[PDB]
Amino acid sequence: QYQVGPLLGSGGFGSVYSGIRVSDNLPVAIKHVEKDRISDWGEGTRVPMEVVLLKKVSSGFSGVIRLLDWFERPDSFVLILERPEPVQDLFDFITERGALQEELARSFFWQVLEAVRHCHNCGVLHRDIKDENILIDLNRGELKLIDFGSGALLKDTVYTDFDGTRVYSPPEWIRYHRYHGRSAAVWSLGILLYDMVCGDIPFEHDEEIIGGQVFFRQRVSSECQHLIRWCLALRPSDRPTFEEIQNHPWMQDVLLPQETAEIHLH
């Protein structure tokens, strides 16, 4: 049913292959995870949490890569996901282009915010928002979220577990092993926005994360600096809500994805 192409990559998320659905030559990605390697399960039977979360968010169009099907094997699960073509991850786009023009960062950041809102509306917290987990559809100018292997159901009580990326993790996790979902998401969004307009993440060490001194290494507008600094407030309750982010003055007059592809990607 799927014709397996080359390996795209592997790591903590499993092994991901290019593929085509035989039935109609639709490009897919085929993702293998061994059961021993999975820690977070969910409710068919016990599936990995990624499957539960993907099903919660894969209905309707969105900026989330959609789960098309999945299979259990004796030692592993196999997930079939959409694959845009052609396609570059945001980490590599940034490495190759350096700091992004503000117009482009705004278009990308806006799309990520809409995707994360979608997930939260569906009851899903991603918990590993970072450039490596965002794909760009280079023709359509559309961003897509991937890798829900560290996610959870969204809740209003405290989380005391975390297996996302530490340099995107908020000070309250580093100091207390405690965070709330939305406020931790907003922190990760601050890290991401900085990454886009400066060309790399602001903090590498625990001490920098909790110190919360933001130093700008590139020329960034005052309005953009203000938004980033707000997302990166040390106190969780001082961070903006998604509405406050999207209403921020830096976020006005966003390009449409087709305009973004035409001006910046084509």
Binding site: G12, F13, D128, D163, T165
Partner: peptide, 8 residues
Amino acid sequence: KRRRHPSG
């Protein structure tokens, strides 16, 4: 200077 950071 710029690198990926694996989860976990």
